[PDB]
Structure formats: C-alpha cells, structure tokens
C-alpha cells in the first residue's frame, strides 16, 4: 500500500564493486518485499538496470530525481530513514505515503543520507528524518538496505516492536 523508495543518489560517485553491492541489496530488498505486502528506485539510470540481476518488470524504476517521482504521484511528505536524526521512527509515521532508503554503502561511514533530506526539502517536500534504534543506540542495527526494509516491515506488517524487529533482522 505505501511506497518503499530506494534513492540511488550518489550512484556515479561509487566504485564498480560498490555499485554491484547496491544492486544486490536492492534485489534482496525486492525479494523481501515479495514475502510481505511497491519498491521504487529513483535515480535509476541505465547502468543500475544493467547491474540489477533481478526482474526490472517487477519493480518501479525512475531515472529522474526522487522529488520528481514524489510530485508525479501526489506525495508531499515522506519518512527518510536516517541514522543521523534525533527522533526515532514510531507508529505515528506509518501514515505517510512513502518511505525512502538511500542507496548507499560504506567502505569509514560518513554522513550521507541527511543530504538526501536537504535535497528533498529544497524541492519543497516535507521530510521526517527517522532513525531506527536498538535500546536507544543505533549500534547493533544492521544498516544494509534490505535489512532496514525488513526492520520496518516487521513493525508495520507483523506488528513487532522496534527492538524485536531489529534483533530478528540482526
Ligand atoms: N539506523 C538506521 N536508521 C534508519 N535508516 C538507516 C539506519 N541505518 C542505515 N539506514 C539506511 O540504510 C541506507 C544505507 S546505510 C548508510 C551509509 C552511510 N554511513 C550513511 O549513513 O550515510 C541509508 O540510506 C539509510 O536510510
């Protein structure tokens, strides 16, 4: 029912190995969403589709900006899964029409995803920066795209709590 968007921002700024890991995690994110309830990939260029070893027919890919995709569907506010926020994702945010997970990997961590929110705000989009915590700290929370998507799904679909959802995906 809602939109799980993967923001392929910073795509051409990653190495070939890192590009493959992003395409792998998006593939695993689809198969995970396949066993639940819808997966969107913005900034989805030709190279991503070339590296995506899954069915392009089964997901929604848009080569343009994420903000354009949100406007083209009437969505004015989203939830940005961001480990750098100070407010934690709660059931009060399960009413938004789209959840955004930035297609980002690491090699040591940097502070990248809040720039996606700054870009969405500059395009006139209400953004709810929400962090996923385990016992108050983000340490121990798996930060892979497919793991983050699974944590949210166990909370929305299966009604688990955040601590239970994080540990089961951990
Ligand atoms: N603790 C957390 N809470 C919410 N989202 C998280 C998260 N950990 C990882 N993610 C999601 O997983 C994606 C890639 S992990 C992000 C890598 C980098 N260290 C950074 O934070 O910028 C991000 O887009 C983010 O939305």
Curated annotation (Swiss-Prot):
Highest taxon above the source species:
Archaea
The parts of the chain that form a coiled coil are none
- Report the residue ranges that make up the SAM-dependent MTase TRM10-type domain in this protein: 1-170
Localization, UniProt:
Cytoplasm
Q: Which residues cross the membrane?
A: none
State the similarity comment: Belongs to the class IV-like SAM-binding methyltransferase superfamily. TRM10 family.
The function of this protein is:
Catalyzes the S-adenosyl-L-methionine-dependent formation of either N(1)-methyladenine or N(1)-methylguanine at position 9 (m1A9 or m1G9) in tRNA.
* Name of protein: tRNA (guanine(9)-/adenine(9)-N1)-methyltransferase
Organism listed in the record: Thermococcus kodakarensis (strain ATCC BAA-918 / JCM 12380 / KOD1)
- Range of the intact protein held here: 98 to 272 of 370
